[PDB]
């Protein structure tokens, strides 16, 4: 997965919990 700080192009490219900021990088709203 993404993670926190993460780039991201959707919050699928993180685990479920990191959510990304409009197409940057994925933010710990879940923490982990």
Do not use: F, I
């Given at each position: ?8 192009s ?21 923490y982990?």
């Amino acid at each position: 997965c993404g993670g926190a700080g993460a780039k991201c192009s959707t919050k699928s490219d993180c685990c479920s919990g990191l959510w990304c900021s409009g197409s940057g990088h994925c933010y710990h709203r879940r923490y982990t």
